[PDB]
Symmetry: C4
Subunit: 79 residues, 4 copies
């Protein structure tokens, strides 16, 4: 990533590692180490991601939003 | 929310996303992105919520308390 | 507690809520809100506790140690 | 460890406790308190480790990398 990784990673049901970074991005890493996708937020992502029962990825950000991102990397909603 | 989301979200058995915020509130978000309820504490909620076997939501706060909130948003107790 | 609760709580198999505090203590709270025990460490407990398969409680502390505490509140070991 | 343990521990399927430290190292502790191995990173490990379905240990670090370490302590990859 392009910033300090304070956030703690979470693993999906297929092995995908989700973690946020201080570079504002939420990363989705494949189990082989190759990047799946990255989602940009308005602030550093100190918050640790969490995965729901349907594979959605929930994480907060320093930009005051709680982001909900689909496993394809597209934004579902944000509070 | 009205503050940086440092706290990390937790998902209940029905999909409800629980996360604290630096605006002193503990938020309960529905899986569709609409707010269920919010509980106000005396300080920023850096602590990440946790869900017990009965659906209770446990989270700490900068106000020195460990809050226990019922899934309806009403305070159970606080230590 | 006597300090900001930055650490995130963990729930044991019987409902006991374990969380650290900035007052150096690791707290064990009963599901009814009454204190079970508290274990003193040499520094603030920002680290979030974790429970092993045998009910042990693992948590770090600002005093550089990784504490292992038995569910009765007595120290097992510390690294 | 040789630094403040801000990171939160994780337990593997055999009881091994994984936690990072502000001394740049990621520690693997046996359930008896004896050190299994330690992996050095370029910065403090505030991030909390996470274990995949195959026993891999994922953790971030202040050095901007998301580390993937095999349970034997050898580096799998890093993003």
């Amino acid at each position: 990533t392009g910033g300090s990784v304070h956030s703690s990673p979470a693993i999906g049901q297929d092995g995908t590692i989700y973690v946020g970074s201080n570079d504002h991005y939420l990363y989705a890493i494949n189990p082989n180490g190759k990047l799946k996708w990255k989602f940009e937020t308005g602030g550093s992502v100190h918050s640790s991601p969490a995965i729901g029962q349907d594979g959605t990825i929930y994480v907060g950000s320093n930009d005051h939003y709680l982001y909900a991102i689909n496993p394809n990397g597209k934004l579902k909603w944000k509070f």
